[PDB]
Write a protein that binds this ligand. Structure first.
Ligand SMILES: NC(=O)c1ccc[n+]([C@@H]2O[C@H](COP(=O)([O-])OP(=O)(O)OC[C@H]3O[C@@H](n4cnc5c(N)ncnc54)[C@H](O)[C@@H]3O)[C@@H](O)[C@H]2O)c1
Ligand SMILES: NC(=O)c1ccc[n+]([C@@H]2O[C@H](COP(=O)([O-])OP(=O)(O)OC[C@H]3O[C@@H](n4cnc5c(N)ncnc54)[C@H](O)[C@@H]3O)[C@@H](O)[C@H]2O)c1
Lengths: 231, 244, 212, 242
């Protein structure tokens, strides 16, 4: 935050979604000049109004990310906070068309996003990036084989990027949500230590926490209520 | 009158280093910190920096651990909603030359001490039906190990499995148990490390400097708050990229 | 053994022959001295064109993914053309393999990853995102297929070479110097012949895992 | 078939009286390794020897006691004129109780045997191999519980998790001396009813593991085939808590 010039500019990709909104709402009350950005411009415009800006982008396409990054920078300034919360979710059932798709918007989408961010964060020698993953990316889950690879490679990527640019005073962290109420279950919640599914804002606080911890980089902060202990 | 306004914080080993920094951090969140420490002289020193109260107890002792929760609960008329175990020592020696005394000392204080504090605190919360958060300070050494710290790593790795277990049992009661894995922090404990070795580690750390005990206290303050209400049975790393 | 012409792929083939080589470049030289083809990891149709050759030749108890490309470079210097390449080879390439091999086995699969896929490394952003993805992928595939008497595992080797220092990055390694392809191959055959072991990432370490 | 990769190895297995410890002694002796059985019960350890050519010998020593641990290694080097190049710690017990009601006795007994017991054995074995300039492979058994934790096992999970950190440290110091130190993470093994049936359904494979399968990884880690694997934890859980 600040007392005059909003030098705390954050970019939340998929800010119109569930996790994206909770982050964009929480940081707004803290003093962060955010930019709600998703595939739907109208969904991002309403989120921004309900100052802050709104952008339309597709993290899968490369030239669309580089275009938005320059568009984002010119209207708010140099971005020193990045939040990637724009991810989507059997054997011998999934077509190859679906594999490449969610391997580009979940994994490659964050890679291209972090790449465009390092062109301005390295020059300013400051910044902090948080990538939204999952315990499924590490521990895995039945029926979510391809989704596990996307959030799994994000773990190795961020930590590799963390050690690469840490001397530029830039931190790259990971959050690993468990089960959340976004856009059977009672027997599964019974196994969960807390006994309930995680709320959207509960993940947001974990994201902001990593954005504000000046000595935490390349760490996967898991928020699952102890789900990683039962599966 | 802030984030942790209604919270009652019990911080063992709050007479120096992280424990003192945690006490300052939590008190800044509007919490009345019950600074516990093996040395009362250093415990009262923390209270004067922050109604607050100091307590003298050896966490390795079962009698001193039970009575600690008895003295605190009877002094504030309420169980500690926040329990932070920072009581730890270092008796480092190579594996081939480490004595039995060097082994039992660290284990009794760091591993057993954490157990007794976590247990008695858990018993105090459930007895009153009170919810809270148990924060045990482990280390990055408890995940990868470190040269000369055979007894220290075995104690810090034990804290993780201890806290994860407690989080599975105290989850139904409303008690969250978490672990913190800090790297090399600018504390009196790391003052025992030769300056030439500190500089070498400083080079190894990706960020390129030692951590501040307030940065570790920032994590503790987050785990104690309701902002981490869905966070339990985890291991937060404050290593600055070290040993990632 | 996918990519069994060079690297750890041939090493797995040799140790297994002592007790079906699939590489990009014809790959027959390895078959000239091993018991028991051409394919690329990126194209699924090419993978299917290879698994179809298995029924006529043998008719796929063990599957080893050792094919991969590793080109170092910074994230800002790295272009999209190579970002998609390593991902479709090291990650998606193993995903398309385990899928076509799921037609049979109704089995033991071992995916050769890396230590940098779990802990990361400087200048290896894309390669870490590639070898790190097959970690959770194998975890999810295991839980789903373990009841089918099929088990998938991951080998995560450290620094594999002919003890090439770096310089001098061998002094940091507790176990003398670098590891060799043969030693890594002994871990692959181990996980393949070990019952009640699935979804485990065995690390051909050498003490490297203890540090960065 | 193609076994006997331990023909010149002296194997020391603590807690080889029954269960996994006994199964390990069979697997190692099956590969021509001179097994030195060690257990709290002398009769139990001597029984295992009878189930094994290499002129084996059983030893009685409380691994929790520092004296019995050091006396154990001295008797082995006096009976075979050489220190054990293969050391596997299987000596451990379980005393389950809720955290809110776990007595100090339940805590100390588990820690002293599982954690402190492993420490004393690993140390004395390391001191033996280094002082003689011998290369070896130290193996320590640490259940999957000591990684994720389990209800009623606060003392057991902390002990087994401590073993991992204990081994990772030893593997770093003894790396220069050519002594590999690894850890094994077994799941739930059918070793000495309603609770068991629920555990099987939880396991992805759908059944309890065998003590022989636990001895499989042990035979590998102690062999030359695993000569570059040190400070690594191996899981034999059948997919449980992967
Ligand atoms: N400082 C670091 O670099 C670092 C890194 C990783 C983990 N840790 C852990 O974090 C915790 C905080 O350490 P620190 O940096 O404050 O070290 P420190 O040396 O500042 O802490 C020592 C304090 O612990 C108290 N204490 C020791 N044994 C006790 C016992 N048996 N009963 C009660 N009190 C006792 C002492 O009174 C003393 O005030 C430690 O337990 C340590 O293991 C520290
Ligand atoms: N299913 C399981 O029980 C299970 C699962 C995973 C891992 N483990 C671990 O693997 C190891 C092998 O287990 P097991 O199946 O043989 O259990 P077990 O119940 O068969 O082991 C009992 C044996 O351990 C010996 N022992 C215990 N404490 C001793 C001491 N202080 N000194 C000397 N001997 C001692 C006893 O003599 C006895 O023969 C154990 O340490 C256990 O922690 C067990």
């Amino acid at each position: 935050h600040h007392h005059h010039h909003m030098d705390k500019v954050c970019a939340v990709f998929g800010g119109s979604r569930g996790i994206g909104r909770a982050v964009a709402q929480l940081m707004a009350r803290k003093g962060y000049r955010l930019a709600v950005i998703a595939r739907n411009l109208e969904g991002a415009k309403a989120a921004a109004g309900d100052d802050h800006l709104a952008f339309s982008c597709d993290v899968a396409k490369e030239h669309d990310v580089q275009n938005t990054f320059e568009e984002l920078e010119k209207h708010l300034g140099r971005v020193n906070f990045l939040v990637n919360a724009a991810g989507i979710n059997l054997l011998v059932r999934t077509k190859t068309e679906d594999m490449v798709s969610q391997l580009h918007t979940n994994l490659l989408g964050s890679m291209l996003t972090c790449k465009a961010a390092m062109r301005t964060m390295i020059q300013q020698q400051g910044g902090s990036i948080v990538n939204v993953g999952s315990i499924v990316g590490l521990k895995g889950n039945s029926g979510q084989s391809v989704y596990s690879a996307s959030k799994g490679g994000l773990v190795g990527f961020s930590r590799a990027l963390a050690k690469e640019v840490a001397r530029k005073k830039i931190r790259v962290n990971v959050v690993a949500p468990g089960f959340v109420h976004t856009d059977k279950e009672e027997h599964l919640k019974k196994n969960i230590p807390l006994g309930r599914f995680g709320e959207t804002i509960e993940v947001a606080h974990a994201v902001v926490f990593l954005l504000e911890s000046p000595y935490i980089t390349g760490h996967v902060l898991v928020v699952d209520g102890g789900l990683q202990l039962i599966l | 009158q802030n984030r942790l306004r209604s919270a009652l914080a019990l911080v063992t080993g709050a007479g120096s280093g992280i424990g003192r920094a945690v006490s300052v951090r939590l008190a800044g969140e509007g919490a009345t910190v019950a600074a516990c420490d093996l040395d009362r002289a250093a415990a009262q020193e923390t209270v004067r920096l922050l109604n607050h109260a100091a307590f003298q107890a050896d966490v390795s002792e079962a009698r001193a651990a039970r009575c600690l929760l008895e003295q605190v609960q009877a002094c504030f008329s309420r169980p500690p909603s926040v329990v932070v175990s920072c009581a730890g020592i270092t008796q480092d020696e190579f594996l081939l030359h480490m004595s039995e005394d060097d082994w039992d000392k660290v284990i009794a204080v760091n591993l057993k001490g954490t157990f007794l504090v976590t247990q008695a605190a858990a018993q105090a919360l459930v007895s009153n039906g009170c919810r809270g958060s148990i924060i045990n300070i482990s280390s990055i050494v408890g995940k990868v190990g470190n040269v000369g710290q055979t007894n220290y790593a075995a104690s810090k790795a034990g804290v993780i499995g201890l806290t994860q277990t407690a989080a599975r049992e105290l989850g139904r009661h409303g008690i969250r148990c978490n672990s913190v894995l800090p790297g090399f922090i600018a504390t009196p404990m790391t003052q025992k490390v030769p300056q030439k070795v500190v500089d070498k580690i400083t080079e190894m750390i990706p960020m390129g400097h030692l951590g501040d005990p307030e940065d570790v206290a920032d994590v503790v303050a987050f785990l104690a708050s309701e902002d981490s209400g869905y966070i339990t049975g985890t291991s937060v790393e404050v290593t600055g990229g070290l040993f990632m």
